[PDB]
Structure 1
Amino acid sequence: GSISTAVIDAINSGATLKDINAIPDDMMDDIYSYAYDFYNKGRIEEAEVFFRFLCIYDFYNVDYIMGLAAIYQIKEQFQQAADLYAVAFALGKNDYTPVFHTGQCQLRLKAPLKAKECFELVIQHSNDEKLKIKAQSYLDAIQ
């Protein structure tokens, strides 16, 4: 999957497509715009193909990763989604939505202590009061 493909790329350490500037920036921006248009039209499969393409070319891109993670969560590939949300967080995503959505994923993965850690982190650090209410709703049901 996405994570294993990234690890194998990193192991092999070769010269990469982006290292070659294989695709210009304004074309990558365009492909991202198309990926999101598929996504907004419900064309989850076209969106996934485009986001997977983007993440092969530039995996360490917050916006690409967040888009693919959302599609994995929709497709109930909850572990891949959780992992990619955490990648986005390490890369600098500047809010707690990756953590909130990872909590949802961990619940579906029957990992309630991980989920609790995610929602508590939202409540303790987010400045989105509505997101914190949603996080508390989830915490209240983990018993």
Structure 2
Amino acid sequence: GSISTAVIDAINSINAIPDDMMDDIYSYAYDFYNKGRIEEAEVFFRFLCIYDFYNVDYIMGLAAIYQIKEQFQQAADLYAVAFALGKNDYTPVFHTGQCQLRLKAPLKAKECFELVIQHSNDEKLKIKAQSYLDAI
């Protein structure tokens, strides 16, 4: 998957696609996604993540697809990458908590939701995180 590609690239380690074209491909990926063409969107986000894995917008798009497809471990892993890339957005941490609950890891999920409540300034996200904590 995207992560193994990133690691292989680093084991083995040119502006082949301009920024404007990458922007266009990202918009096409969401066109597919928004129409329910999840498989085509997944290919396009995987393509983007092969070219530029360390891009928070590409990673978040792919992580969303895996969460929808109930591939919760892959989703949680990518959301954690997204947080490392975007340290001030707790949305990926919230979604990681959801994934951990589905993975039968409620203590990991609780820690995710607690991080949101302590550190996020998104008041609506904090309510959602608290609703999960109340159920745990």
TM above 0.5: yes
Q: Which residue number corresponds to residue 112 of structure 2? A: 118
What is the DSSP-based 3-state SS (H/G/I as helix, E as strand, rest coil) of the residue aligned with 1:22?
A: coil
The range that moved more, 21-30 or 84-93, is: 84-93
The answer (yes or no) to whether the contact 1:66–1:85 under 8 Å persists in 2 is yes
The range that moved more, 120-129 or 54-63, is: 120-129
Partners of 2:102 and 2:43 lie apart in 1 by: 24
The answer (yes or no) to whether the contact 1:2–1:80 under 8 Å persists in 2 is no
The offset of 1:95, in angstroms, is 1.4
Partners of 1:72 and 1:141 lie apart in 2 by: 24
The offset of 1:69, in angstroms, is 0.5
In the alignment, structure 1 residue 42 sits paired with structure 2 residue 42 = no
* Stretches of structure 1 lacking an aligned partner (at least 5 in a row): 14-19
The offset of 1:93, in angstroms, is 5.1
Task: Output one character per residue of 1:39-81: Cα deviation in whole Å (capped at 9) or x when no partner.
Answer: 1111111110100000000000010001000001111111111
Q: Report the TM-score when normalising by structure 2.
A: 0.95
Partners of 1:95 and 1:24 lie apart in 2 by: 27
Partners of 1:94 and 1:36 lie apart in 2 by: 24
* Stretches of structure 2 lacking an aligned partner (at least 5 in a row): none
What is the DSSP-based 3-state SS (H/G/I as helix, E as strand, rest coil) of the residue aligned with 1:53?
A: helix
The answer (yes or no) to whether the contact 1:3–1:80 under 8 Å persists in 2 is no
Q: Which residue number corresponds to residue 4 of structure 2? A: 4
How many residue pairs were aligned? 136
The range that moved more, 50-59 or 2-11, is: 2-11
Partners of 2:130 and 2:112 lie apart in 1 by: 11
What is the DSSP-based 3-state SS (H/G/I as helix, E as strand, rest coil) of the residue aligned with 2:70?
A: coil
The offset of 1:5, in angstroms, is 2.0
Q: Which residue number corresponds to residue 54 of structure 2? A: 60
**Divergent runs of 4+, >6 A:** none
Name the CA shift for 1:93/1:70 in 2 (closer, same or farther; >3 Å): farther
Q: Report the TM-score when normalising by structure 1.
A: 0.91
